[PDB]
Amino acid sequence: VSAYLSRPSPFDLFIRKSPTITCLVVDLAPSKGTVNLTWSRASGKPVNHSTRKEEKQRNGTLTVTSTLPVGTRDWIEGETYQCRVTHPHLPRALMRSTTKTSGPRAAPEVYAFATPEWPGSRDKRTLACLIQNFMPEDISVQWLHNEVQLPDARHSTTQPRKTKGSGFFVFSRLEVTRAEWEQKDEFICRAVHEAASPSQTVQRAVSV
């Protein structure tokens, strides 16, 4: 029985302009009672209506999440939100809180590229992107075929990792068909991040 609270994704915060935070509760072994999640603002101000999702996987996880729409300005100004998790059997209630990260800011550096695909085949052509030197750690990464964005499910992005002083880096891998591999020059890796002024967005086409 664990719980996690995540900050808004930069994409939802700066592009979409409709930030949300999510409280995720994982129950390795389900005993039946209801799992409650309560939201509150440290400032005492009112919180909006949240969305609850319950999903079972007979593997060993009754996943439960609650997504709370957050004010854009309030979040940027530092409001702190709290998720109070109430599971039937446990003594004390779980409590998680989140706020914007403070500290210095640094823009992301983006580098997209293709992996050598030397004939004689059994395959998977791959495009990949390295995004680095950014801080804080929150960032949204997305692939585009020119001006149109591809579904998220198509790429795999690693978790932000610290480095030597610089800040953070993330790596994204995108497997593509032979067809789109012929127009790889048209694929673009885009990063959305707070420190990337103007418009918190930085992108680069696959170098060839």
Added chain:
Amino acid sequence: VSAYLSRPSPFDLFIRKSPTITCLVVDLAPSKGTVNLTWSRASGKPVNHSTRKEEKQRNGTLTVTSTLPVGTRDWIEGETYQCRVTHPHLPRALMRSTTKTSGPRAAPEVYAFATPEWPGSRDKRTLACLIQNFMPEDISVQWLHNEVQLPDARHSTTQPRKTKGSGFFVFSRLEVTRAEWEQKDEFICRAVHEAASPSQTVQRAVSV
């Protein structure tokens, strides 16, 4: 209070030829009693002497690990080892087990490269490597300046991530000085993995 048991690193198993497994126990809040770790072989056979390490970080973690030297052949043949963790306050003892992963095998594909370093500076030149299409997920990655291996602490490697059917991929980043950046053609990314016959090793120099 959590526990983790890891399999041997491919490097220790195939190059060094002296495999070890490690039981790591993390105690977020220390109450003082002793933390015991007991090793056993599912086959009942004798286990060697293990090495115990205790380290404190007033942050909130009394880390404790026990490393057990493992037989090369026994491990390759499928022996299963168990770590029985005994902490003072908890009711039942924690138990973790590990064995070689079964299933299909696939060699790693290695691609090393340098990130564009366009003048006008405040910096960090970087070399990076993408290793993919391998399975099982255990792999050792290392950087070398020609024939000599660099200290591990110098690079950062992501955790193996699944993909679409293919298998796994891992990304490694290596920040270098302006000096070594002049001889980047000499840096090599090497992967040690079971399916990479001959000698379970595959490497590639930084493409330029």
